[PDB]
Amino acid sequence: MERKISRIHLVSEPSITHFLQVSWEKTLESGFVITLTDGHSAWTGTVSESEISQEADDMAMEKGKYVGELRKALLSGAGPADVYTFNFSKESCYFFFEKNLKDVSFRLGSFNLEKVENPAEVIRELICYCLDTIAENQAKNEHLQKENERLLRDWNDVQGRFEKCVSAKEALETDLYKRFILVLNEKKTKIRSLHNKLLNA
Protein backbone atom coordinates (compact mmCIF):
# COMPACT_ATOMS: atom_id res chain seq x y z
CA MET A 1 0.00 0.00 0.00
CA GLU A 2 1.65 3.20 -1.25
CA ARG A 3 0.35 6.62 -2.26
CA LYS A 4 1.90 9.73 -3.79
CA ILE A 5 0.54 13.29 -3.85
CA SER A 6 1.68 15.63 -6.62
CA ARG A 7 1.03 19.19 -7.77
CA ILE A 8 -0.03 20.05 -11.33
CA HIS A 9 -0.90 23.11 -13.42
CA LEU A 10 -3.95 22.56 -15.61
CA VAL A 11 -3.63 24.35 -18.94
CA SER A 12 -7.29 25.44 -18.83
CA GLU A 13 -6.62 27.70 -15.81
CA PRO A 14 -2.81 27.85 -15.39
CA SER A 15 -3.03 30.19 -12.39
CA ILE A 16 -4.22 27.88 -9.57
CA THR A 17 -2.48 24.59 -8.83
CA HIS A 18 -4.24 21.25 -8.40
CA PHE A 19 -3.27 18.21 -6.34
CA LEU A 20 -3.49 14.64 -7.62
CA GLN A 21 -3.06 11.63 -5.33
CA VAL A 22 -2.35 8.23 -6.88
CA SER A 23 -2.34 5.09 -4.73
CA TRP A 24 -1.29 1.58 -5.72
CA GLU A 25 -0.79 -1.74 -3.94
CA LYS A 26 2.54 -3.07 -5.28
CA THR A 27 3.17 -1.42 -8.66
CA LEU A 28 1.25 0.67 -11.17
CA GLU A 29 1.21 -2.34 -13.51
CA SER A 30 -1.59 -4.09 -11.61
CA GLY A 31 -3.54 -0.87 -11.20
CA PHE A 32 -4.10 2.20 -9.08
CA VAL A 33 -6.66 4.77 -7.97
CA ILE A 34 -6.24 8.48 -8.78
CA THR A 35 -7.99 11.46 -7.20
CA LEU A 36 -7.77 15.06 -8.42
CA THR A 37 -8.64 18.02 -6.20
CA ASP A 38 -8.40 21.80 -6.20
CA GLY A 39 -9.60 22.68 -2.68
CA HIS A 40 -13.30 23.05 -3.55
CA SER A 41 -14.41 19.98 -5.54
CA ALA A 42 -12.73 16.66 -6.28
CA TRP A 43 -12.91 13.88 -8.86
CA THR A 44 -11.90 10.24 -8.56
CA GLY A 45 -11.08 7.40 -10.93
CA THR A 46 -9.46 3.99 -11.07
CA VAL A 47 -7.22 2.20 -13.57
CA SER A 48 -7.02 -1.60 -13.61
CA GLU A 49 -4.58 -4.08 -15.14
CA SER A 50 -6.87 -4.59 -18.14
CA GLU A 51 -7.17 -0.86 -18.84
CA ILE A 52 -3.43 -0.17 -18.61
CA SER A 53 -2.65 -3.25 -20.71
CA GLN A 54 -5.12 -2.15 -23.40
CA GLU A 55 -3.70 1.38 -23.41
CA ALA A 56 -0.14 0.04 -23.74
CA ASP A 57 -1.18 -2.29 -26.56
CA ASP A 58 -2.82 0.63 -28.37
CA MET A 59 0.52 2.41 -27.91
CA ALA A 60 2.51 -0.50 -29.39
CA MET A 61 4.90 -0.01 -26.47
CA GLU A 62 6.64 -2.35 -24.07
CA LYS A 63 4.77 -2.76 -20.79
CA GLY A 64 7.84 -1.91 -18.72
CA LYS A 65 8.57 1.26 -20.68
CA TYR A 66 4.94 2.39 -20.47
CA VAL A 67 4.88 1.73 -16.72
CA GLY A 68 8.10 3.69 -16.25
CA GLU A 69 6.78 6.63 -18.27
CA LEU A 70 3.54 6.61 -16.27
CA ARG A 71 5.52 6.57 -13.02
CA LYS A 72 7.64 9.50 -14.24
CA ALA A 73 4.61 11.54 -15.32
CA LEU A 74 2.28 10.85 -12.38
CA LEU A 75 4.68 10.44 -9.43
CA SER A 76 6.42 13.76 -10.20
CA GLY A 77 9.40 11.84 -11.56
CA ALA A 78 10.53 14.77 -13.68
CA GLY A 79 13.72 13.99 -15.57
CA PRO A 80 16.59 16.31 -16.45
CA ALA A 81 14.76 17.51 -19.59
CA ASP A 82 11.12 16.49 -20.02
CA VAL A 83 7.82 18.39 -19.77
CA TYR A 84 4.41 16.79 -19.26
CA THR A 85 1.19 18.74 -19.85
CA PHE A 86 -2.07 17.73 -18.16
CA ASN A 87 -5.60 18.97 -18.80
CA PHE A 88 -9.00 18.06 -17.37
CA SER A 89 -12.19 19.00 -19.22
CA LYS A 90 -14.67 19.54 -16.40
CA GLU A 91 -17.74 19.62 -18.65
CA SER A 92 -16.96 16.15 -20.03
CA CYS A 93 -15.14 15.05 -16.85
CA TYR A 94 -12.22 13.84 -18.98
CA PHE A 95 -8.67 14.18 -17.62
CA PHE A 96 -5.73 13.38 -19.89
CA PHE A 97 -1.99 13.98 -19.86
CA GLU A 98 0.45 14.31 -22.76
CA LYS A 99 4.24 14.51 -23.10
CA ASN A 100 5.06 17.89 -24.63
CA LEU A 101 8.20 17.44 -26.73
CA LYS A 102 9.14 20.86 -28.15
CA ASP A 103 6.22 21.56 -30.52
CA VAL A 104 5.37 17.84 -30.97
CA SER A 105 3.00 16.55 -28.29
CA PHE A 106 2.44 12.84 -27.67
CA ARG A 107 -0.65 12.07 -25.59
CA LEU A 108 0.28 9.65 -22.81
CA GLY A 109 -2.86 8.80 -20.84
CA SER A 110 -6.54 9.66 -20.61
CA PHE A 111 -9.31 8.73 -18.18
CA ASN A 112 -12.86 9.76 -17.26
CA LEU A 113 -13.27 10.76 -13.61
CA GLU A 114 -16.54 10.94 -11.68
CA LYS A 115 -17.28 14.00 -9.53
CA VAL A 116 -17.52 12.72 -5.96
CA GLU A 117 -20.49 14.22 -4.15
CA ASN A 118 -18.47 14.72 -0.95
CA PRO A 119 -15.13 16.54 -1.42
CA ALA A 120 -14.72 17.30 2.28
CA GLU A 121 -14.11 13.64 3.14
CA VAL A 122 -11.33 13.21 0.56
CA ILE A 123 -9.70 16.52 1.50
CA ARG A 124 -9.76 15.54 5.18
CA GLU A 125 -8.30 12.11 4.39
CA LEU A 126 -5.49 13.72 2.38
CA ILE A 127 -4.73 16.12 5.23
CA CYS A 128 -4.72 13.26 7.74
CA TYR A 129 -2.32 11.24 5.58
CA CYS A 130 -0.03 14.26 5.20
CA LEU A 131 0.01 14.87 8.96
CA ASP A 132 0.71 11.19 9.69
CA THR A 133 3.61 11.04 7.24
CA ILE A 134 5.15 14.30 8.47
CA ALA A 135 4.94 13.10 12.08
CA GLU A 136 6.57 9.79 11.12
CA ASN A 137 9.34 11.60 9.23
CA GLN A 138 9.97 13.92 12.18
CA ALA A 139 10.22 10.97 14.58
CA LYS A 140 12.59 9.14 12.23
CA ASN A 141 14.78 12.23 11.85
CA GLU A 142 14.93 12.75 15.61
CA HIS A 143 15.90 9.12 16.22
CA LEU A 144 18.55 9.20 13.49
CA GLN A 145 20.03 12.45 14.83
CA LYS A 146 20.20 11.02 18.36
CA GLU A 147 21.90 7.86 17.08
CA ASN A 148 24.38 9.89 15.03
CA GLU A 149 25.26 12.09 18.00
CA ARG A 150 25.81 9.06 20.24
CA LEU A 151 27.96 7.36 17.60
CA LEU A 152 30.02 10.53 17.11
CA ARG A 153 30.64 10.78 20.86
CA ASP A 154 31.69 7.12 20.98
CA TRP A 155 34.00 7.60 18.00
CA ASN A 156 35.62 10.62 19.65
CA ASP A 157 36.19 8.62 22.84
CA VAL A 158 37.68 5.67 20.95
CA GLN A 159 39.95 7.97 18.93
CA GLY A 160 41.22 9.58 22.12
CA ARG A 161 41.91 6.19 23.68
CA PHE A 162 43.73 5.07 20.52
CA GLU A 163 45.89 8.20 20.61
CA LYS A 164 46.72 7.49 24.25
CA CYS A 165 47.60 3.87 23.47
CA VAL A 166 49.86 4.73 20.54
CA SER A 167 51.56 7.41 22.65
CA ALA A 168 52.12 4.96 25.52
CA LYS A 169 53.49 2.23 23.22
CA GLU A 170 56.87 3.95 22.89
CA ALA A 171 57.01 4.70 26.61
CA LEU A 172 56.36 1.03 27.37
CA GLU A 173 59.06 -0.04 24.90
CA THR A 174 61.69 2.29 26.35
CA ASP A 175 60.78 1.37 29.93
CA LEU A 176 61.09 -2.32 29.07
CA TYR A 177 64.49 -1.77 27.45
CA LYS A 178 65.71 0.27 30.43
CA ARG A 179 64.61 -2.43 32.88
CA PHE A 180 66.27 -5.05 30.68
CA ILE A 181 69.59 -3.22 30.74
CA LEU A 182 69.32 -2.67 34.51
CA VAL A 183 68.88 -6.37 35.26
CA LEU A 184 71.52 -7.33 32.68
CA ASN A 185 74.02 -4.98 34.34
CA GLU A 186 73.12 -6.56 37.68
CA LYS A 187 73.89 -10.00 36.24
CA LYS A 188 77.15 -8.70 34.77
CA THR A 189 78.14 -7.42 38.21
CA LYS A 190 77.24 -10.81 39.70
CA ILE A 191 79.36 -12.72 37.18
CA ARG A 192 82.24 -10.27 37.62
CA SER A 193 82.12 -10.74 41.39
CA LEU A 194 82.07 -14.53 41.00
CA HIS A 195 85.03 -14.40 38.61
CA ASN A 196 86.99 -12.16 40.99
CA LYS A 197 86.26 -14.48 43.91
CA LEU A 198 87.36 -17.51 41.89
CA LEU A 199 90.57 -15.74 40.86
CA ASN A 200 91.29 -14.83 44.48
CA ALA A 201 90.65 -18.42 45.58
Binding site: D154, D157, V158, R161, C165, A168, A171, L172, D175, Y177, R179, F180, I181, V183, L184
Partner: protein
Protein backbone atom coordinates in the same frame (compact mmCIF):
# COMPACT_ATOMS: atom_id res chain seq x y z
CA UNK B 1 72.94 -0.65 21.14
CA UNK B 2 74.70 -3.82 22.30
CA UNK B 3 71.45 -5.24 23.68
CA UNK B 4 69.66 -4.45 20.41
CA UNK B 5 72.44 -6.12 18.41
CA UNK B 6 72.30 -9.21 20.64
CA UNK B 7 68.52 -9.42 20.33
CA UNK B 8 68.72 -9.12 16.54
CA UNK B 9 70.92 -12.22 16.62
CA UNK B 10 68.14 -14.44 17.95
CA UNK B 11 65.89 -15.53 15.09
CA UNK B 12 62.66 -16.73 16.71
CA UNK B 13 61.22 -18.65 19.65
CA UNK B 14 57.75 -20.20 19.32
CA UNK B 15 58.22 -23.36 21.40
CA UNK B 16 55.85 -22.30 24.22
CA UNK B 17 52.16 -21.48 24.69
CA UNK B 18 50.31 -18.32 25.76
CA UNK B 19 49.48 -19.73 29.19
CA UNK B 20 53.15 -20.61 29.70
CA UNK B 21 54.11 -17.06 28.71
CA UNK B 22 51.58 -15.60 31.15
CA UNK B 23 52.86 -17.80 33.98
CA UNK B 24 56.48 -16.92 33.20
CA UNK B 25 55.67 -13.20 33.02
CA UNK B 26 53.95 -13.37 36.41
CA UNK B 27 56.94 -15.26 37.83
CA UNK B 28 59.39 -12.60 36.62
CA UNK B 29 57.23 -9.74 37.90
CA UNK B 30 56.95 -11.37 41.32
CA UNK B 31 60.67 -12.18 41.46
CA UNK B 32 61.79 -8.65 40.54
CA UNK B 33 58.78 -6.79 42.02
CA UNK B 34 58.12 -5.16 38.64
CA UNK B 35 54.44 -4.52 39.42
CA UNK B 36 55.09 -0.75 39.54
CA UNK B 37 55.24 -0.48 35.73
CA UNK B 38 52.67 1.76 34.00
CA UNK B 39 51.13 -1.37 32.43
CA UNK B 40 50.84 -5.13 33.03
CA UNK B 41 49.34 -4.96 36.54
CA UNK B 42 46.12 -6.49 35.17
CA UNK B 43 48.03 -9.58 33.99
CA UNK B 44 47.63 -11.23 37.40
CA UNK B 45 43.84 -10.78 37.10
CA UNK B 46 41.54 -12.43 34.56
CA UNK B 47 38.77 -10.23 33.16
CA UNK B 48 35.40 -11.32 31.77
CA UNK B 49 32.91 -9.08 29.97
CA UNK B 50 29.12 -9.32 29.70
CA UNK B 51 29.20 -8.94 25.92
CA UNK B 52 26.90 -11.96 25.38
CA UNK B 53 23.12 -11.80 25.68
CA UNK B 54 23.20 -15.39 27.00
CA UNK B 55 26.03 -16.20 29.39
CA UNK B 56 28.48 -18.88 28.22
CA UNK B 57 27.33 -18.59 24.60
CA UNK B 58 29.63 -17.94 21.64
CA UNK B 59 26.85 -17.27 19.10
CA UNK B 60 25.24 -14.18 20.69
CA UNK B 61 27.99 -11.56 20.54
CA UNK B 62 26.94 -7.98 21.29
CA UNK B 63 29.76 -6.32 19.34
CA UNK B 64 29.30 -2.67 18.45
CA UNK B 65 29.28 -1.00 21.87
CA UNK B 66 31.64 0.50 24.43
CA UNK B 67 32.13 -2.98 25.92
CA UNK B 68 34.30 -4.24 23.05
CA UNK B 69 36.58 -1.20 23.11
CA UNK B 70 36.82 -1.41 26.90
CA UNK B 71 37.84 -5.07 26.68
CA UNK B 72 40.42 -4.28 23.99
CA UNK B 73 41.88 -1.47 26.10
CA UNK B 74 42.01 -3.76 29.13
CA UNK B 75 43.87 -6.36 27.07
CA UNK B 76 46.29 -3.68 25.86
CA UNK B 77 46.98 -2.55 29.44
CA UNK B 78 47.86 -6.17 30.31
CA UNK B 79 44.53 -7.64 31.45
CA UNK B 80 43.97 -11.29 30.53
CA UNK B 81 40.62 -11.23 28.72
CA UNK B 82 38.80 -14.56 29.00
CA UNK B 83 35.84 -15.44 26.77
CA UNK B 84 34.74 -18.39 28.95
CA UNK B 85 33.27 -18.08 32.45
CA UNK B 86 35.68 -20.44 34.18
CA UNK B 87 36.03 -20.83 37.94
CA UNK B 88 39.41 -19.07 37.71
CA UNK B 89 37.90 -15.74 36.67
CA UNK B 90 38.66 -13.00 39.19
CA UNK B 91 37.23 -9.84 37.57
CA UNK B 92 33.90 -9.35 35.78
CA UNK B 93 32.78 -6.13 34.09
CA UNK B 94 29.06 -5.34 33.73
CA UNK B 95 27.85 -2.38 31.69
CA UNK B 96 24.72 -0.32 32.22
CA UNK B 97 22.66 -3.52 31.86
CA UNK B 98 22.21 -4.96 35.36
CA UNK B 99 19.53 -7.53 34.48
CA UNK B 100 21.89 -10.49 34.92
CA UNK B 101 23.49 -9.30 38.17
CA UNK B 102 21.54 -12.03 39.97
CA UNK B 103 22.93 -14.68 37.63
CA UNK B 104 26.49 -13.44 38.15
CA UNK B 105 26.01 -13.42 41.93
CA UNK B 106 24.62 -16.96 41.84
CA UNK B 107 27.56 -18.16 39.74
CA UNK B 108 30.00 -16.47 42.12
CA UNK B 109 28.34 -18.16 45.10
CA UNK B 110 28.40 -21.56 43.38
CA UNK B 111 32.08 -21.27 42.46
CA UNK B 112 34.58 -22.08 45.20
CA UNK B 113 36.49 -18.86 44.45
CA UNK B 114 34.46 -15.64 44.34
CA UNK B 115 35.13 -12.90 41.78
CA UNK B 116 34.29 -9.34 42.79
CA UNK B 117 31.56 -7.64 40.77
CA UNK B 118 32.97 -4.60 38.97
CA UNK B 119 31.60 -1.87 36.73
CA UNK B 120 32.95 -0.46 33.48
CA UNK B 121 33.55 2.98 35.02
CA UNK B 122 36.12 1.47 37.39
CA UNK B 123 38.65 0.73 34.65
CA UNK B 124 38.00 4.10 32.99
CA UNK B 125 38.87 5.86 36.25
CA UNK B 126 41.82 3.56 36.94
CA UNK B 127 43.50 4.01 33.54
CA UNK B 128 44.09 7.72 34.13
CA UNK B 129 45.56 6.97 37.56
CA UNK B 130 47.40 3.92 36.16
CA UNK B 131 46.75 2.11 39.45
CA UNK B 132 44.31 -0.53 40.69
CA UNK B 133 41.57 1.53 42.32
CA UNK B 134 39.81 0.04 45.33
CA UNK B 135 36.88 -2.15 44.29
CA UNK B 136 34.78 -1.22 47.34
CA UNK B 137 33.61 2.03 45.73
CA UNK B 138 33.02 0.26 42.38
CA UNK B 139 31.48 -2.99 43.65
Amino acid sequence: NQLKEVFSGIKNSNEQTPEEMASLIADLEYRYSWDCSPLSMFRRHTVYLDSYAVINDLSTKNEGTRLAIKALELRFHGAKVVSCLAEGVSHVIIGEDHSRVADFKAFRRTFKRKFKILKESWVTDSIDKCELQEENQYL
